[PDB]
Amino acid sequence: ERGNLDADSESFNKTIQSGDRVFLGEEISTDAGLGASNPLLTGTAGNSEGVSLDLSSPIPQTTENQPLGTYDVDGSGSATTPNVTLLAPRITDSEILTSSGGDVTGSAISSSDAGNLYVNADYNYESAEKVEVTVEDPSGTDITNEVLSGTDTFVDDGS
Amino acid sequence: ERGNLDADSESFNKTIQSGDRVFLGEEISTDAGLGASNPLLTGTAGNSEGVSLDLSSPIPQTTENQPLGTYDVDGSGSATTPNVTLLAPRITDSEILTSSGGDVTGSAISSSDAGNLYVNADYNYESAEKVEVTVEDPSGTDITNEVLSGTDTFVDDGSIGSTSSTGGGVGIDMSDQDAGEYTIILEGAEDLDFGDATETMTLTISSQDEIGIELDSESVTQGTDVQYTVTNGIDGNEHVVAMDLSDLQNDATTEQAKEVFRNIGDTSEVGIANSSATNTSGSSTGPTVETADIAYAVVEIDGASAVGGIETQYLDDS
Amino acid sequence: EVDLEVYDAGVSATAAVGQDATNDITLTIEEGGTTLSSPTGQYVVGSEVDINGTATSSDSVAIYVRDDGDWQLLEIGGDNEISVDSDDTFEEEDIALSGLSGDGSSILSLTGTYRIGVIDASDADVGGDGSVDDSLTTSEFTSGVSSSNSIRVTDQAL
């Protein structure tokens, strides 16, 4: 579903329902959901009032041409009906820790002990999309499949 | 009509009705519609309230002197009557794809295979105006009529990934043209051709360089991994890099031969194959090291080149 | 010498046959060169060799062998033609001249001194379908753009 993404073993979902949250760079799906039943959305209050949000097209970014806020179907009015709030995508904290704790990011580690490392992060967009991990050698090549050990390249929020 | 533009075989229409959408660079028609019945419009809320919108004149741009929003006939008030919302013109994504998929934009392609190319794009202004395609030679001349193949120069909204002329997108047969770097120009039919409404997709045509392979080093010892790169291949297709088992050490085992090629880079599957069956790294079910005769690693390509790797360990000193 | 004639604005196509041109410009056109490089000098019977050469103005090229008579076509294989790059150069992989099937190859099987030449797609079945399928005579081979060089076949070795 949406908001509980790992419950269906899906890395993403774009079937937005009424009252959910939407992020800056999403690409809404025009299939069943709030993408064909109500493709035209208008702002409600603040800097977003009057401004329109076209769900049939990719959503712009950097807080220009799409102000953050709650969006009505009627605009600033007396209706609270199919509904979207627009947030911003964010990664807050992320660390690399050894099998018994201890951050080792940005620091040289012994090759012998670098065999049970972990990668963790906190991200704002958990309802929409998981976050990928891609290890790159100094030469600049994807070595992820060689070094992967588990969790299927997807790291959850928190943790 | 308006909002369903291709339904009447029209490239544009400027007969705006109440409640429709209007873009920044339009030039409203003062004929029958909401251009003579109600030429004066005023803003409703937000930054657009109080500001007027003159439909009898071309609409300004860059979000100055015409704020985005819903416009009333009365302004900010208790009337919801003849009506216009003002959006911005946009092209979001656009690609050039071969007859069986595979983006080839910004990358050199063989003249022989550049005969069934397609151009696709996504644009915000579908109710108002279609978007034109204009192929330009490196000398800077319109060669569109020579290379056009179908769809009548008009590409529909959506239709990204459409490999057939049935869907939206225009096909260009760039096989006859000489080698060079070409620019495909997309812009609106009449008015929406300014910034953020037009995009130039480049394309390079050159002689088909046969598959090229290079190594970061030629003289290496055992154990030292070597990275090999495949060059000048068609995007989206799977090459096969082979390893003759005669070069392998004689005292190797079945599991010892399936790890000559690493999963580094764009490699898809690794294993050892025979003329009848193959033994991949997934399981030891197919031919054994003495039974098999070749070691392979099927590798795709993303862009112009792909990189893999080998393990010179357990290799004959020759 | 080739000329270009322009006419005044508003003139029709049919009515412009007789009226003099307002201005003109002339350019010269010459014939290009099509020579072979690698199949020259010596050739071991049954061996394989590449086709190396250049062609300034060509799209499809064919290889012919002559010995005291007609130029028998050599069936190189796929489409009996080689494309030319932008650098006015065409090349082919290692091909065994005698190994390949066709009566053209049969001349080269026997030991002796022969002639081999290349010709552009100007033949086009000396008029007809767009395929090189003939045995052009001396006049037909020489009339179009072409070039030939002396070749002799030496028996095998070890």
mmCIF file with all atom_site columns, C-alpha atoms in Angstrom, chain A residues 146, chain B residues 220-226 243-245 247-253 255-262 295 309-317:
data_model
loop_
_atom_site.group_PDB
_atom_site.id
_atom_site.type_symbol
_atom_site.label_atom_id
_atom_site.label_alt_id
_atom_site.label_comp_id
_atom_site.label_asym_id
_atom_site.label_entity_id
_atom_site.label_seq_id
_atom_site.pdbx_PDB_ins_code
_atom_site.Cartn_x
_atom_site.Cartn_y
_atom_site.Cartn_z
_atom_site.occupancy
_atom_site.B_iso_or_equiv
_atom_site.pdbx_formal_charge
_atom_site.auth_seq_id
_atom_site.auth_comp_id
_atom_site.auth_asym_id
_atom_site.auth_atom_id
_atom_site.pdbx_PDB_model_num
ATOM 1  C CA . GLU A 1 146 ? 29.881 -8.132  -4.723  1.00 0.00 ? 146 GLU A CA 1
ATOM 2  C CA . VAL B 2 220 ? 49.783 -8.199  -14.347 1.00 0.00 ? 220 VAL B CA 1
ATOM 3  C CA . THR B 2 221 ? 50.535 -10.995 -11.897 1.00 0.00 ? 221 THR B CA 1
ATOM 4  C CA . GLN B 2 222 ? 48.232 -13.622 -10.426 1.00 0.00 ? 222 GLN B CA 1
ATOM 5  C CA . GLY B 2 223 ? 45.617 -12.499 -7.924  1.00 0.00 ? 223 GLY B CA 1
ATOM 6  C CA . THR B 2 224 ? 45.498 -8.960  -9.333  1.00 0.00 ? 224 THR B CA 1
ATOM 7  C CA . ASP B 2 225 ? 41.983 -8.183  -10.541 1.00 0.00 ? 225 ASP B CA 1
ATOM 8  C CA . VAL B 2 226 ? 41.750 -6.543  -13.971 1.00 0.00 ? 226 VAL B CA 1
ATOM 9  C CA . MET B 2 243 ? 36.923 -17.242 -21.466 1.00 0.00 ? 243 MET B CA 1
ATOM 10 C CA . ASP B 2 244 ? 38.685 -20.234 -22.992 1.00 0.00 ? 244 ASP B CA 1
ATOM 11 C CA . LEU B 2 245 ? 39.104 -23.017 -20.439 1.00 0.00 ? 245 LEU B CA 1
ATOM 12 C CA . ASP B 2 247 ? 43.966 -20.824 -20.291 1.00 0.00 ? 247 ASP B CA 1
ATOM 13 C CA . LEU B 2 248 ? 42.590 -22.003 -16.936 1.00 0.00 ? 248 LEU B CA 1
ATOM 14 C CA . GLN B 2 249 ? 44.841 -23.826 -14.498 1.00 0.00 ? 249 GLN B CA 1
ATOM 15 C CA . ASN B 2 250 ? 44.610 -27.598 -14.847 1.00 0.00 ? 250 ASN B CA 1
ATOM 16 C CA . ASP B 2 251 ? 44.045 -28.211 -11.119 1.00 0.00 ? 251 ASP B CA 1
ATOM 17 C CA . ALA B 2 252 ? 40.907 -26.048 -11.013 1.00 0.00 ? 252 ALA B CA 1
ATOM 18 C CA . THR B 2 253 ? 37.493 -27.321 -9.930  1.00 0.00 ? 253 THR B CA 1
ATOM 19 C CA . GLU B 2 255 ? 33.278 -24.002 -8.445  1.00 0.00 ? 255 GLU B CA 1
ATOM 20 C CA . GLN B 2 256 ? 36.775 -22.619 -9.090  1.00 0.00 ? 256 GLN B CA 1
ATOM 21 C CA . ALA B 2 257 ? 35.992 -21.780 -12.736 1.00 0.00 ? 257 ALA B CA 1
ATOM 22 C CA . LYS B 2 258 ? 32.658 -20.009 -12.181 1.00 0.00 ? 258 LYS B CA 1
ATOM 23 C CA . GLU B 2 259 ? 34.369 -17.120 -10.355 1.00 0.00 ? 259 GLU B CA 1
ATOM 24 C CA . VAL B 2 260 ? 36.771 -15.976 -13.082 1.00 0.00 ? 260 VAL B CA 1
ATOM 25 C CA . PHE B 2 261 ? 34.392 -13.126 -13.969 1.00 0.00 ? 261 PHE B CA 1
ATOM 26 C CA . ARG B 2 262 ? 33.087 -10.996 -11.107 1.00 0.00 ? 262 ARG B CA 1
ATOM 27 C CA . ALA B 2 295 ? 33.591 -19.494 -19.241 1.00 0.00 ? 295 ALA B CA 1
ATOM 28 C CA . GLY B 2 309 ? 36.233 -7.407  -14.200 1.00 0.00 ? 309 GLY B CA 1
ATOM 29 C CA . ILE B 2 310 ? 38.272 -10.593 -14.141 1.00 0.00 ? 310 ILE B CA 1
ATOM 30 C CA . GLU B 2 311 ? 40.223 -12.536 -11.516 1.00 0.00 ? 311 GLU B CA 1
ATOM 31 C CA . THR B 2 312 ? 43.673 -13.306 -12.922 1.00 0.00 ? 312 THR B CA 1
ATOM 32 C CA . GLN B 2 313 ? 44.077 -15.699 -9.982  1.00 0.00 ? 313 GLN B CA 1
ATOM 33 C CA . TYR B 2 314 ? 44.178 -19.368 -11.032 1.00 0.00 ? 314 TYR B CA 1
ATOM 34 C CA . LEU B 2 315 ? 45.237 -18.518 -14.589 1.00 0.00 ? 315 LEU B CA 1
ATOM 35 C CA . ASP B 2 316 ? 48.059 -20.078 -16.590 1.00 0.00 ? 316 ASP B CA 1
ATOM 36 C CA . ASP B 2 317 ? 51.236 -17.993 -16.791 1.00 0.00 ? 317 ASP B CA 1
#
